[PDB]
């Protein structure tokens, strides 16, 4: 019995993206609109819908967001208040262990080899051998604090790179997830254990179009590990929308009203993949025990994310039960060869063993594989966040902006202070003070969880990950502390904003407080974007007649995706969306 899923298998990319157009679907090429996915994931309501008696009475202006990795830039702000900025670049140091090998070759051909005066000259075969310079690690300050700037790398990819370059285990590195899609440039603080500055710098890669750069700052004792792991207290988001309909006056008015009125603090799709089956769907399948379907959905999402996995998943699905073990073996071998993450490689190997050996041909083996799978906590957290989104939507639908006998943050309270609990297990369900309202309460929370199959997050408890500690109280709506906007005219969308690494390369310092029009913002010209970018954006331009490009820089308090605010303001479409596939 082979694994299976429920939704269609759509490969987002192309089998050969040679023209710059990566998205295979025509609508995705013209711009991916995740309105339906958001509605299914919980983002049902909108502040404008609440305000206006009607819903979607006036179509929101169309916009296209993060078509280039430089478009979205995120900088973390830790509880200590220090911002995450790219200060200086340090390269991995190497030590030469061997001497260059040379061979003597005849200098001239006319003179015979029998001549004692034969002239020979050396030619180098190997310049030498080098080894990464592992530094000395003091035993009193094992914890290393660093800052990481990643252009378009997912957190899972960063962890995998650390693991295979450095040979460490995932629990040795603590990187807090950063709101917004992973496609854009993201700079964040990080904490690691038992690593030295030299090797942590070796873990980086400076000579790639998408730079992943590490840099240590100082050592710390293990006592302050919890203090360093405390969740960040701010995020500076710099965004660039390419094709926005309207005019400068109306765009600025919309942004002014949005800033004044705040925006709902939903868990954007960065938490739950955009695939047909979501992380919470996988979690509920695993909880109810259909491990076969859970692993099938996991493979389905991985296939949608990656092309080769898509090629092999269909072969596995359509393989005759006689040849399915060989197809699974080939899939596992291909994953190992292309050097996919070890967890997926082992999952495919276990699937092959399950299909081959009759000993493993039982649900017990699949349950063991799922237990070994390290994503279970992430899936359960995604389910809890989905429940919180649904409950917040219901709260806004029932009560609205006004506050009546609702939970508030304990520093007449305001809606900004109004908060709702996100149930991260039985411990949260007990300790948290759920709102005492007749329609909405712990009873409705439990009813929704039971009807959607998420009863596990109330029946049992889930540990708080050390990398990103749980946040039980999440505000209802949030207002950017600072918000600067600029509007430019570019019907062909050649505008661009320089990244932190670009500023460092040109030797100026990086400022995170506000949008730097003189430095960060580049005026529209053909020499601002790549030719591949132009080829990719031509299809979008043939559909969206957006003469206005908006460059904005905002601050968000604890954890919020600027795409939520931009969704409440405009109707946004993501040209680059593969980053939302969290797994792999």
């Amino acid at each position: 019995m082979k694994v299976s899923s429920r939704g269609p298998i759509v490969r987002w990319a192309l089998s050969r993206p040679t023209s710059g157009l990566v998205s295979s679907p025509s609508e995705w090429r013209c711009g991916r609109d995740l309105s339906d996915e958001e509605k299914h994931s919980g983002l049902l309501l909108r502040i404008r819908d609440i305000c206006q008696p009607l819903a979607k009475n006036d179509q929101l202006p169309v916009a296209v967001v993060k078509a280039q990795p430089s478009d979205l830039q995120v900088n973390e702000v830790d509880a200590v208040g220090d911002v995450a900025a790219l200060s200086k670049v340090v390269k991995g140091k190497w030590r030469k262990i061997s001497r260059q090998k040379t061979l003597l070759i005849e200098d001239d051909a006319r003179t015979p080899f029998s001549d004692p005066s034969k002239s020979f000259s050396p030619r180098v075969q190997s310049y030498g051998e080098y080894v990464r310079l592992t530094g000395k690690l003091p035993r009193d300050l094992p914890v290393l604090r660093f800052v990481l700037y990643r252009d378009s790398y997912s957190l899972n990819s960063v962890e995998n790179r650390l693991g295979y370059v450095l040979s460490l285990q995932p629990d040795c590195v603590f990187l807090r997830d950063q709101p917004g899609g992973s496609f854009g440039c993201i700079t964040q603080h990080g904490v690691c254990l038992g690593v030295t500055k030299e090797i942590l710098s070796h873990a980086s890669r400076h000579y790639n179009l998408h730079p992943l750069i590490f840099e240590p700052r100082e050592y710390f004792s293990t006592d302050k590990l919890h203090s360093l792991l405390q969740g960040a207290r701010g995020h500076h988001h710099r965004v660039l929308l390419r094709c926005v309909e309207g005019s400068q006056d109306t765009i600025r008015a919309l942004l002014k009203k949005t800033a004044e009125r705040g925006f709902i603090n939903y868990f954007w799709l960065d938490r739950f993949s955009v695939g047909t089956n979501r992380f919470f769907d996988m979690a509920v399948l695993a909880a109810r025990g259909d491990y076969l379907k859970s692993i099938g959905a996991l493979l389905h999402c991985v296939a949608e994310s990656n092309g080769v996995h898509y090629d092999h998943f269909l072969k596995y699905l359509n393989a005759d039960p006689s040849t399915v073990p060989g197809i699974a073996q080939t899939w596992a071998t291909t994953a190992k060869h292309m050097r996919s993450p070890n967890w997926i490689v082992q999952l495919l190997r276990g699937l092959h063993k399950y299909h081959a050996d009759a000993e493993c041909g039982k649900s017990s083996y699949l349950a063991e594989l799922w237990s070994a799978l390290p994503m279970r906590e992430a899936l359960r957290r995604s389910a809890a966040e989905f429940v919180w989104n649904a409950m917040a939507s219901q709260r806004l639908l029932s009560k609205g902006l006004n506050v009546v006998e609702g939970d508030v943050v304990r520093m007449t309270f305001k809606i900004t202070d109004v908060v709702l609990p996100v149930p991260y297990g039985s411990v949260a369900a007990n300790n948290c003070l759920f709102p005492h309202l007749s329609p909405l309460d712990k009873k409705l929370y439990v009813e929704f969880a039971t009807k959607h199959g998420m009863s596990f997050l109330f029946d049992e408890q889930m540990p708080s990950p050390l990398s990103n500690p749980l946040q039980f109280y999440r505000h209802l709506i949030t207002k950017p502390v600072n918000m600067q906007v600029s509007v430019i005219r570019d019907p062909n969308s050649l505008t661009s904003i320089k990244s932190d690494l670009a500023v460092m390369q040109e030797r100026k310092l990086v400022q995170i407080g506000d949008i730097d029009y003189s430095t960060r913002v580049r005026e529209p010209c053909v020499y601002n974007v790549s030719e591949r970018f132009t080829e990719k954006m031509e299809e979008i331009l043939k559909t969206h007649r957006g003469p206005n490009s908006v460059v904005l820089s905002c601050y968000l308090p604890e954890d919020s995706s600027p795409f939520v605010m931009l969704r409440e303001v405009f109707d946004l479409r993501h040209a680059s969306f593969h980053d939302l596939y969290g797994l792999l």
Partner: peptide, 12 residues
């Protein structure tokens, strides 16, 4: 309690 009906359940 309209969100329960608005958001249909799914089991992949």
């Amino acid at each position: 309690a309209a969100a329960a009906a608005a958001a249909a359940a799914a089991a992949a």
